[PDB]
Amino acid sequence: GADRMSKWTSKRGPRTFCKGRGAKGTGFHGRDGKFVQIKEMIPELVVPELAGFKLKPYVNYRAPEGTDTPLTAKQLFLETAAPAIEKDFKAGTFDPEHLEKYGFEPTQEGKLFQLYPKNFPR
């Protein structure tokens, strides 16, 4: 009999069984049977300029570490919006209906990189 514990890959089947190995698709099938590759589907690697970047893969051994303080939503809010909203309330122009000036986003569907749908891979 055949084997059941081994993985069922494309190498173990007939000619008509061609299963992918996990890569993402990059296009579709055109008119004359060929493959039309879409340049918007291929990932564009955004590489920065490492010329004047003074940072190495390792750090100094004598450099001190820090206590583990995982960044939280409350800490991020206190760092980015608490001073602005506090100053606005002290000045007396606070508007509870409009919070877009402090960084809040009502709907994610407007901008490019939304957070809940996660339109960006990485």
Partner 1 sequence: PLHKVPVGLWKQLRLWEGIYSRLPRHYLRSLEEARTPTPVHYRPHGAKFKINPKNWQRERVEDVPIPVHYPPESQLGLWGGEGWVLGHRYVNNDKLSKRVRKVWKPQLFQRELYSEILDKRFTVTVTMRTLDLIDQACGFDFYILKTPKEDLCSKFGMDLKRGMLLRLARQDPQLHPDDPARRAAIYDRYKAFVIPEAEAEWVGLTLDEAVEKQRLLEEKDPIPLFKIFVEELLGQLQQQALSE
Residues that bind partner 1 (CB under 8 A): 73-74, 77, 81-82, 85-86, 89-90, 96, 99, 104
Question: Is 14 annotated as ligand-binding?
Answer: yes
- Binding of residue 25 to Mg ion (CB under 5 A): no
Residue labelled with tokens 């955004």: 46
Q: Which CB atom, from 9 or from 80, has the smaller least distance to partner 1?
A: 80
Choose among 23, 20, 62: nearest CA to 43. Answer: 23
3-class DSSP state of 109: coil
**Least gap, CB of 115 to RNA (angstroms):** 14
Q: Which does 89 bind (CB under 5 to 8 A by kind): Mg ion, partner 1, RNA, none?
A: partner 1
User: Residue 102, exposed/middle/buried by CB under 10 A (0-12, 13-18, 19+)?
Assistant: middle
- Binding of residue 119 to RNA (CB under 7 A): no
Q: How far apart are CA 56 and CA 25, in angstroms?
A: 35
Which two tokens mark 116? Answer: 């809940």
Q: How far apart are CA 81 and CA 88, in angstroms?
A: 10
> Which stretch in 1-9, 46-54, 84-92, 93-101 sits in contact with RNA by CB under 7 A?
1-9
As a whole number of Å, the CA-based R_g of the chain is 26
Residues 2-41 that bind RNA (CB under 7 A): 2-3, 6-9, 11-31, 33-41
- Binding of residue 44 to RNA (CB under 7 A): no
User: Residues forming the annotated binding site for Mg(2+)?
Assistant: 10, 13-14, 17
